From a paper:
In mammals, the most abundant and best-studied NDPKs are [name] and NME2 (hereafter abbreviated [name]/2), which are closely related isoforms (88% sequence identity) with similar functional attributes and localization in the cytosol and nucleus. [name]/2 are hexameric enzymes that catalyze the reaction XTP + YDP ⇆ XDP + YTP by first transferring the γ-phosphoryl group from XTP (usually ATP) to residue His118, and then from the phosphohistidine to YDP, where Y is any of the four common (deoxy)nucleosides. Briefly, each [name] subunit within the D3-symmetric hexamer comprises an antiparallel four-stranded β sheet flanked on either side by a layer of helices. In this study, we showed that [name] binds AcCoA and CoA with similar affinity via a binding mode distinct from that of canonical ADP and ATP substrates and critically dependent on the CoA 3′ phosphate group.
Efforts to cocrystallize murine [name] with the ligands led to high-resolution (1.96 and 2.2 Å, respectively) crystal structures of [name] bound to SucCoA and ADP, and a somewhat lower (2.6 Å)–resolution structure bound to CoA. CoA and SucCoA bind to this site via their common nucleotide moiety, the only part of these ligands specifically recognized by [name]. Second, the high resolution of our [name]/SucCoA crystal structure revealed several water molecules structurally conserved across hexamer subunits that play an important role in compensating for the shift of CoA nucleotide atoms relative to their counterparts in ADP. Important water molecules are numbered 1 to 6. Three of these are conserved between the ADP- and SucCoA-bound structures. The CoA 3′ phosphate group forms direct H bonds with Lys12, Tyr52, Asn115, and His118 as well as water-mediated H bonds with Arg88, Arg105, and the Gly119 backbone. Compared to ADP, the α and β phosphates of CoA are displaced upward and are solvent accessible, pointing out of the pocket to direct the CoA pantetheine end away from the protein surface. Consequently, the acyl-bearing end of CoA remains solvent accessible when bound to [name] and potentially free to interact with other protein partners, consistent with our findings that [name] binds similarly to acylated and non-acylated CoA. Incubating [name] with either AcCoA or SucCoA yielded similar spectra, revealing that [name] does not strongly discriminate between these ligands and CoA. The recorded profiles revealed that the melting temperature of [name] (Tm = 60°C) was enhanced similarly by each of the tested ligands (ΔTm ≈ 3.7°C), confirming that AcCoA and SucCoA bind [name] with similar affinity to CoA.
Residue numbers in the entry:
A (entry chain C): 0 to 152
B (entry chain A), D (entry chain F), E (entry chain D): 1 to 152
C (entry chain B): -1 to 152
F (entry chain E): -2 to 152
Amino acid sequence: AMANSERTFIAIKPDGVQRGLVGEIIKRFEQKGFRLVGLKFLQASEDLLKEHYTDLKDRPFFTGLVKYMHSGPVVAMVWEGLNVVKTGRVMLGETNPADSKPGTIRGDFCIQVGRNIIHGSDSVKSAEKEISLWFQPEELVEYKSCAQNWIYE
Amino acid sequence: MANSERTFIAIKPDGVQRGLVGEIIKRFEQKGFRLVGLKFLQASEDLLKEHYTDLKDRPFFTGLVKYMHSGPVVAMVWEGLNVVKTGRVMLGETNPADSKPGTIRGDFCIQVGRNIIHGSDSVKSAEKEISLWFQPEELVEYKSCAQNWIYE
Amino acid sequence: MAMANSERTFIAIKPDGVQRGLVGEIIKRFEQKGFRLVGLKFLQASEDLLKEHYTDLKDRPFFTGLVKYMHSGPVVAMVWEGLNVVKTGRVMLGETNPADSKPGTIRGDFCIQVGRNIIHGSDSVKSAEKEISLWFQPEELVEYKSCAQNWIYE
Amino acid sequence: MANSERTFIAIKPDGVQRGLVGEIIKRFEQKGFRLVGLKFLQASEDLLKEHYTDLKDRPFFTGLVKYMHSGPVVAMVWEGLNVVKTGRVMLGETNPADSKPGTIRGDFCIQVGRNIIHGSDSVKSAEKEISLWFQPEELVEYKSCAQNWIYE
Amino acid sequence: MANSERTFIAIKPDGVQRGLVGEIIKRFEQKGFRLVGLKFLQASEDLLKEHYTDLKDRPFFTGLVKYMHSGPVVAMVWEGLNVVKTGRVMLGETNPADSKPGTIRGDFCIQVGRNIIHGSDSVKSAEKEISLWFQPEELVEYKSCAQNWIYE
Amino acid sequence: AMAMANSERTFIAIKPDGVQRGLVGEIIKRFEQKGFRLVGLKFLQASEDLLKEHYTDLKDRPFFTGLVKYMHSGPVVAMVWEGLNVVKTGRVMLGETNPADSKPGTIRGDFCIQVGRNIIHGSDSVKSAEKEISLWFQPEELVEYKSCAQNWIYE
């Protein structure tokens, strides 16, 4: 119930993996001071993706999104820290890469909406839902970062 | 074809002198834009008076043409979806004082007369600046191996 | 080239900045921006120094915990010089509150919480002159001409 | 094929703690090797004793297992021509004292007990370590978009 | 003048395709070498066949030319003290298997047929390769603002 | 505290060409990311007398007078770094004294070219390092603290 232990779901999409951005993206979260809790590599099924993007069932791009997210492996991640959901999105940049600012992950590394390299949860509620959807509870590891007292007061 | 749009980017003589050529090209590559043209030359004053012809009546114009002739520049053509507008965002505000950190100008320079880089401000200007600095046979068209992961 | 280009600001890397190994990365950003380094030292600031440094915050509820924490480890104190370096230096640092710091800034990229914002920079020219005189003796500020001066300033 | 060789790379608990996961993964990506498996776990002691089974009688074995159990690791499988041998070169000498600048250990660590990373020393060891740390359901095979530009 | 030695560096089609152009130029800039020529082109097969004329009897020659012609390349001239020999050191062993981490091929490529870059092996070869790839009009000479901090 | 070998110190000086070419942050970052601990740091124009004492073993060599004049000609970053075998490993990190022999990935291998502009100096021995540290720094300028990752750097 601690603010500093909030968690978010970050997924590196198949274009991110294919273009070699996995380390660069993870690096950005480490240097910010957030803590890695969950990490895995899989080719997501369409049933998983249909559940993940369930709020978009009725959008013309939903079919192409589900099937594109299936077309290659993704990196699934859970990161933990104070306001990690909100600050994650800031670090990611705007969902539509056209408006992402240089310095953000999307603003620095991608161009088009169908190919926006990354996803991050839009709310603490979406996060807990997405974490449970992609991770099993035993796949989430907690540890104390040696630099915790220098990240948090 | 929206994905084939081109913009002219020029690394100005201070950008070449301060060692920023690779860093600037690296940013356009890692963004996903595709290099089409690349040369290194000391631009002539006639070329520069035509490049900055809209500034002909401004009090800084003669100094701009003269300074831009004082060293070699790196002339580039980049291709991609909305590469003109997005390229300008990557460059930062023309005035380095208002450039945001993360942009080329925000990270790498300070003052307006030494703003290290230029990019076309419109599709119409890009087409003119490309034809002004590059000959058609100097612009190379190839398919990036990541084309299907950059564009849907 | 002008003496407006001689403006100076005080930048201090806080104990969290030193502990988390950001000293080089921070100095790099000022170097690659074109600012010139004028003073650089490494010390554990005394409480008298810190209280005088944050004299304007003497009546703030976080003052005692700010002064003790800044004393709890060593800091890197720097003086940088350049046109509008005070204002531009605050832009590079990002918002004082890390939550509002944009990506691309020092705080937006490297820290999370207000008590641990890794870096301080003078907020005005008057603050800078008072802070530089507070942390650096005149003999510890070195002036030299950058080989790139003529390509940074017109 | 030869280009489908695989090695097991594990980022030890000190590399996770010191914020090295991204940097390490970047070096394998930019080298051109392909990521096949990736997980984050706290290895059990039983797994670690089988992983280091050739060291049962070394005076550091018990402390090595205990240290490798003290915190989570990142476990990885990478694929490519000679990834086992080249992987070890990238890592640097097992003892960081001897690792050259430019390697992971040469750049990032100091002491043998805290050498941030492990990589299989042979194709035999790799296959054994991959089977030990990964199940078939965790190994993803995809075709990199740059394959024909990394390989003949 | 010894500090005026020049070498020819070519970023091969795989280096362009995998987005390494900026990273490579950066390494030469930060070392303190000076860019003298820079161009982007698709090399004709006649040019490539003369460039590699010493290799025409090797079994790999036909496929080397095809690979070197399969996409555009970035051709470059770089000037500095012992730039021919030191460029090779920076590039790494021609065979990427032998290249050390910290070199260009050591950090970025794997296989002999896709080794991302070429540098002249001698001053004599350099003068030949430069004349072959660059016309006199395409070379620039300027004083680097750091020359006196690079060279006593 | 740890074993006393973990507390060895070396003197590192970023020369005027290191400062002029914008390498200060890059150099410090390599020492930080390697695990070593920063113990002293100052910016100054060293007097020729200081430099003649620093290089006293070279006082009769043909390059000595110009090396002394050159090192005085602009400001230097003087640092003290602490860690296991930091003297020897620091020298490996810097690369060979002659830049032409310095391998890529080292400080001199990546960033410079010629003998008289080799951007950096590091102590060559423990004994040298004690002498240079005392020459360049007063003891009250050397700061002792515990690195938060010490248990992950040292066994």
